[PDB]
Amino acid sequence: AKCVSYGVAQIKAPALHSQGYTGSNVKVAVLASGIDSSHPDLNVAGGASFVPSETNPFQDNNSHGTHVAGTVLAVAPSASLYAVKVLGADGSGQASWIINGIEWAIANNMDVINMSLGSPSGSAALKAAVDKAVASGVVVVAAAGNSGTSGSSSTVSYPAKYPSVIAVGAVDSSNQRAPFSSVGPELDVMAPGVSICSTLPGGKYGALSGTSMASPHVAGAAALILSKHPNWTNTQVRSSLENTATKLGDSFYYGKGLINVEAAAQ
């Protein structure tokens, strides 16, 4: 990655890099607003658009899909990225478009799905799609949501709210929960999500905050783990991440804590 970001070090990715593991031969689908494939710092292996008004998955007129793509690569430099456009420029997308993208990712044998997206409601069909992906052996990772807190109520977004998905909240560089990071019993793990510097459309770079920034740290971690243990099932990869996370506080706000890819990759 050309832009320096603390988040890579924080999850202990450099430890795997030093072991020689960089996520080689792992297919990661980035379900977002597209990826700017013209960016010098990004290679994209394939993709598809399901947004009828924005037909090109290899451009990104929102900027977050490109940023998320770069974070996956910062953490797993050798991962193969696929641009699955399911959100438009304003960062919103119809429920069915997201399901179409999940079905594409399954049919094209993705190893990891990163969904840096989240709505206040899901659907039986959306749950069925992520459940199908998991059943098919895909590691499914999603941003927990940027809806802050609501007393004792869960504020975790969909599809992160579904048990089959790894719901990722955001911490800052001191492991403090970000004020916007969604909370609830469905929250699984945390990753760096405040002022993360990554790639932006038009060969640019910049810091962004959000659980959509936290999520690709975990998607990239799964790619590192798979490169060390390509025989591990999604079940084993998920278990390794949750079981070896660094405890940060109450699981309502923190899940199991901060991912530690060094520990996870045993």
The piece of 50-58, 159-167, 174-182, 210-218 that touches Na ion (CB under 5 A) is 159-167
Does position 167 bind Na ion by CB under 5 A? yes
Q: CB nearer to Na ion: give 39 or 256.
A: 256
Shortest CB 43 distance to Na ion, Å: 30
Encoded one letter per residue, x for contact with Na ion by CB under 5 A and - for no contact, window 24-63 reads: ----------------------------------------
Q: CB nearer to Na ion: give 28 or 165.
A: 165
Does position 169 bind Na ion by CB under 5 A? no
Shortest CB 144 distance to Na ion, Å: 8
3-state secondary structure the chain: CCCCCHHHHHCCHHHHHHHCCCCCCCEEEEEECCCCCCCCCCCCCEEEECCCCCCCCCCCCCCHHHHHHHHHHHHCCCCEEEEEECCCCCCCCCHHHHHHHHHHHHHCCCCEEEECCCECCCCHHHHHHHHHHHHCCCEEEEECCCCCCECCECCCCECCCCCCCEEEEEECCCCCECCCCCCCCCCCEEEECCCEEEEECCCEEEEECCHHHHHHHHHHHHHHHHHHCCCCCHHHHHHHHHHCCECCCCHHHHCCCECCHHHHCC
Does position 139 bind Na ion by CB under 5 A? no
Shortest CB 99 distance to Na ion, Å: 18
Q: CB nearer to Na ion: give 106 or 189.
A: 189
Shortest CB 133 distance to Na ion, Å: 13
Does position 126 bind Na ion by CB under 5 A? no
Does position 186 bind Na ion by CB under 5 A? yes
Ranked by CB distance to Na ion, the top (closest) residue is 167
Other C-beta atoms lying within 10 Å of the C-beta of residue 243: 10
The piece of 57-65, 147-155, 167-175, 213-221 that touches Na ion (CB under 5 A) is 167-175
In the chain, the largest separation of any two C-alpha atoms, in whole Å, equals 45
Does position 141 bind Na ion by CB under 5 A? no
> In the numeric block, which tokens belong to residue 169?
């909240």
Does position 214 bind Na ion by CB under 5 A? no
Does position 113 bind Na ion by CB under 5 A? no
Q: CB nearer to Na ion: give 74 or 170.
A: 170
Does position 182 bind Na ion by CB under 5 A? no
- Judged by the rule CB under 5 A, the positions of this chain that interact with Na ion are 165, 167, 186
